């Protein structure tokens, strides 16, 4: 799952726990994504799996094309509203939580991404970086 990423992601503040609705950033046809699990989550009692920018999650399309709904497909968190600290000392937070639809190999289902893309997400996933318009 998460081993299909290129590069090692630093620790950052998790801002999208399970059952969080985030906006679909790509033109796949989905409007929002419902997070049901996060890849690489260990065994901690009572703690919800939580996701941050660049993480891969399993998500369900609550609103969108009917064929897209009613199933589980992998997603990548691309934008986060919770603030996280880059190792250089800058605190980042996007205006909204956003994700994109990808296959387990890591290639996104969409053809373009709307809005900024987290630099950490772009570095981990080249395909998202390739389709991104601006990376910040």
Partner 1 sequence: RVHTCYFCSGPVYPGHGIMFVRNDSKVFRFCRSKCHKNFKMKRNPRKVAWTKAYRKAHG
Partner 2 sequence: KFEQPRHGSLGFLPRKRASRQRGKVKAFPKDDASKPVHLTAFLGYKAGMTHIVRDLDRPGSKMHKREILEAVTVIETPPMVVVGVVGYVETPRGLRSLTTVWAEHLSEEVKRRFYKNWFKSKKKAFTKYAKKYAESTQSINRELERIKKYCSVVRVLAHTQIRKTPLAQKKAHLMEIQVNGGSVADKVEWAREHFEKTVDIKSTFEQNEMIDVIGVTRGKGNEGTTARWGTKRLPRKTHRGLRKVACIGAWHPANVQWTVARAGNAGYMHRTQLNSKIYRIGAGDDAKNASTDFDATEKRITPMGGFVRYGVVENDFVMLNGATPGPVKRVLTLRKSLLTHTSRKALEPVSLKWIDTASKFGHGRFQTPAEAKQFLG
Partner RNA sequence: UCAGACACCAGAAAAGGUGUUAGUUC
Partner RNA sequence: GUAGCCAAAUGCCUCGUCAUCUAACUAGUGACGCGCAUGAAUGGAUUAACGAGAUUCCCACUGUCCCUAUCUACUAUCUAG
Partner RNA sequence: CCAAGACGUUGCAUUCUUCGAUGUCGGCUCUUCCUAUCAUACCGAAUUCGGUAAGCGUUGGAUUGUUCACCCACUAAUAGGGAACGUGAGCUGGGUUUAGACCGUCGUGAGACAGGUUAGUUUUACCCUACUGAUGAAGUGUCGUCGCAAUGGUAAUUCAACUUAGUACGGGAACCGUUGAUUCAGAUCAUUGGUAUUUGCGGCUGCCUGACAAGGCAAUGCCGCGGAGCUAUCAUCUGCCGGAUAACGGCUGAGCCAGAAUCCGUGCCAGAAAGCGACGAUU
Partner RNA sequence: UGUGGAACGGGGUAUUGUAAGCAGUAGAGAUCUGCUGAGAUUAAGCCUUUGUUCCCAAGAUUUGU
| Gap between the Cα atoms of 41 and 44, Å rounded | 9
In the complex, minimum distance from the CB of residue 37 to partner 1, in angstroms, rounded to a whole number = 27
Decide which of RNA, partner 1, partner 2, none touches 129; Cβ closer than 5 to 8 Å per partner kind: none
Tell me which residue of 42, 37, 78, 80 sits closest to 59, measured CA to CA: 37
Q: Which is nearer to RNA, 45 or 134 (CB)?
A: 45
Q: Which stretch binds RNA (CB under 7 A): 24-32, 45-53, 95-103, 125-133?
A: 45-53
Single residue of 45, 66, 67, 111 touching partner 2 by CB under 8 A: 45
| Gap between the Cα atoms of 108 and 125, Å rounded | 9
In the complex, minimum distance from the CB of residue 117 to partner 1, in angstroms, rounded to a whole number = 9
Instruction: Based on the shown chain and the rule CB under 7 A, indicate whether residue 69 belongs to the binding site for RNA.
Output: yes
Backbone angles phi, psi at 123, to 5 degrees: -65, -45
Single residue of 10, 96, 103, 104 touching partner 1 by CB under 8 A: 96
| DSSP notation for 97-109 | -EEEEB-TTS-BS
Instruction: Name the token pair of 67.
Output: 């064929």
3 state SS of 35: strand
CA atoms in the 13 A half-sphere facing the CB of 136: 11
Instruction: Based on the shown chain and the rule CB under 7 A, indicate whether residue 71 belongs to the binding site for RNA.
Output: yes
Residues in touch with RNA (CB under 7 A): 1-3, 6-14, 17-19, 34, 36-50, 58, 60, 62, 69-72, 83-85, 89, 91
């Amino acid at each position: 799952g998460r081993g299909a990423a290129s590069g090692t992601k630093y620790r950052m503040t998790l801002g999208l726990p399970v059952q969080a609705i985030m906006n679909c950033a790509d033109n796949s046809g989905a409007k929002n994504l419902y997070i049901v699990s996060v890849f690489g989550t260990g065994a901690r009692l009572n703690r919800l799996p939580a996701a941050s920018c660049g993480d891969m999650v399993l998500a369900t399309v609550k609103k969108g094309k009917p064929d897209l709904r009613k199933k589980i497909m992998p997603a990548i968190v691309v934008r986060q509203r919770k603030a996280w600290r880059r190792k250089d000392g800058v605190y980042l937070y996007f205006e909204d939580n956003a994700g994109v639809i990808v296959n387990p190999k890591g290639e996104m289902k969409g053809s373009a991404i709307t809005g900024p893309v987290a630099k950490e997400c772009a570095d981990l996933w080249p395909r998202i970086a390739s389709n991104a318009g601006t990376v910040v």
